[PDB]
């Protein structure tokens, strides 16, 4: 009955949302009572008929930021950087720029002062262009005052964390972070040998969309991973103590809230909500206006442990993919919803919520 109920629950949560959002393929992984549960739906590729499996690689887009945050957490807990470091401390190119007055924390938590959602399309995946972009960037408002969800913000945070560790971000992820997290199906650059696992992404008119190179793509949205691996990462988050101490600490560093915007407490990468909270509030927290509009932050007097009765989540999308990860530290409950369509965050949260609610009920 338990496996049946869980399947019934996940199917009931997933299938209508897949149909409603014409999601070709969707992988759910749920960590429940110390066990992974995988539910795979539809097609990794509509064209070659490859089914989604728990090993299908999906672009997780901005969910990558939680990996980025973990690397940063590593840098932080390795004392290679501090959250209150000015950004320019970790990149000479930024000295003299406004990043002299912007903390790593600001970058991490999108409060640098209006760094946009994405790099402008003019900024290519080019060290110099990224350098030039930040050098010329000016805060729209005081750093530390407004959250404007931003790839270049946390991208730079990750980039600087990498710099603080003296290695390229991508190399640190591949050589240290992913192996530390026991992730062998998690890639910034999917190996050729794993490309068969790489789901097709689908956008408008089902145009195939796999994420192309972009500035700080690795940091912002670089990860392709399987539901199984992303759940392993969720499990690492649920149980940092299961990782070697440096990485346990790194993960812990992503479970610290720095401010609140509405119901959301912003950690490094992870965004936390009190749990339970209504689906609508969780959706609002993961809504377009939340992402696209600056929100005055309510800074916490001290970093808040993002644990216990909290839902930590991250939405992530690429043009062709829509990922959502949510976990409830205090419930040893985690779920991953990876889809090869960028379907509305609200819908991802709806699936997650239906699953979480059904697990409660
Ligand atoms: C993360 O996925 C962010 C944003 N996250 S959010 O849903 O939580 O608001 C959603 C879109 N987004 C993101 O990173 N977009 C990338 C997608 C990749 C393609 N585009 C160029 C690819 N080189 C960059 C924008
Ligand atoms: Cl970007």
CATH number at residue 170: 3.40.710.10
Which residues make Cβ contacts (< 8 Å) with residue 15, sequence separation at least 6?
41
Beta-carbon contacts of residue 361 (< 8 Å; ≥ 6 apart): none
Q: Is 78 annotated in some ligand binding site?
A: no
3-class SS of residue 24: coil
- Cβ of 150 closer than 6 Å to ligand 1, yes or no, is no
Q: Ligand 1: which atom is nearest the Cα of residue 213? A: 23
Please tell me the distance from the alpha carbon of residue 183 to that of residue 174, in angstroms, as a whole number.
9
Angle between helices 64-77 and 227-238 (to 10 degrees): 40
At 34, phi and psi to the nearest 5? 80, 15
Is the separation of the CB atoms in 329 and 310 below 8 Å?
Answer: yes
Cβ pair 328, 235 in contact under 8 A: no
Q: CA 80, 181, 316: angle at the middle one, nearest 5? A: 90
Ligand nearest to the CA of 285: 1
CA distance linking residue 28 with residue 226, whole number of Å: 10
Residue showing tokens 């976990």: 327
Measured CA to CA, the distance from residue 275 to residue 290 in angstroms comes to: 19
Q: What are phi and psi of 184, to 5 degrees?
A: -110, 0
Closest CA to ligand 1's atom 16: 318
Q: Which domain range does residue 271 map to? A: 1-361
Does the beta carbon of 71 lie inside 6 Å of ligand 1?
Answer: no
Our count of domains for the chain comes to 1
- For 26-55, give one letter per residue: b (16+ CB within 10 A) or e: bbbbbbbeeebbbbbbbbbbeeeebebbbb
**Pocket-testing residue among 68, 284, 316, ligand 1, by greatest number of atoms within 8 A of Cβ:** 316
Do residues 335 and 325 touch, judged by C-beta distance below 8 A? yes
Structure tokens at 212: 């192309």
> Which residues have CB under 8 Å from 168's CB, separation 6+?
162
């Amino acid at each position: 009955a338990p496996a049946d109920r869980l399947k019934a629950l996940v199917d009931a949560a997933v299938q209508p949302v897949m149909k409603a959002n014409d999601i070709p393929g969707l992988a759910v992984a749920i960590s429940l009572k110390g066990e992974p549960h995988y539910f795979s739906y539809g097609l990794a590729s509509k064209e070659d008929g490859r089914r989604v499996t728990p090993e299908t690689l999906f672009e997780i887009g901005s969910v990558s930021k939680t990996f980025t945050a973990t690397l940063a957490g590593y840098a932080l807990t390795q004392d290679k950087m501090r959250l209150d470091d000015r950004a320019s401390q970790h990149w000479p190119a930024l000295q003299g720029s406004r990043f002299d007055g912007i903390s790593l924390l600001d970058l991490a938590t999108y409060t640098a002062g209006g760094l946009p959602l994405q790099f402008p399309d003019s900024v290519q995946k080019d060290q110099a262009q990224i350098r030039d972009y930040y050098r010329q960037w000016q805060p729209t408002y005081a750093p530390g005052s407004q959250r404007l969800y931003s790839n270049p913000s946390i991208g730079l945070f990750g980039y600087l964390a990498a710099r603080s560790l003296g290695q390229p971000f991508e190399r640190l992820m591949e050589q240290q972070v992913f192996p530390a997290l026991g992730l062998e199906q998690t890639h910034l650059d999917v190996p050729e040998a794993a490309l068969a696992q790489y789901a097709q992404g689908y956008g408008k008119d089902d145009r195939p969309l796999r994420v192309g190179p972009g500035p700080l793509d690795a940091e912002g949205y670089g990860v392709k991973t399987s539901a199984a691996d992303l759940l392993r990462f969720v499990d690492a988050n649920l149980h940092p103590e299961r990782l070697d101490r440096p990485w346990a600490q790194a993960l812990d560093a992503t479970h610290r809230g720095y401010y609140k915007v509405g119901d959301m407490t912003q950690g490094l990468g992870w965004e936390a909500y009190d749990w339970p909270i209504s689906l609508k509030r969780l959706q609002a927290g993961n809504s377009t206006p939340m992402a696209l509009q600056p929100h005055r932050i309510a800074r916490l007097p001290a970093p808040q442990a993002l644990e216990g009765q909290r839902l930590l989540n991250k939405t992530g999308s690429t043009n062709g993919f829509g990922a959502y990860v949510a976990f409830v530290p205090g419930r040893d409950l985690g779920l991953v919803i990876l889809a090869n369509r960028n379907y509305p965050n609200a819908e991802r949260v709806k699936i997650a919520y239906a699953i979480l609610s059904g697990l409660e009920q």
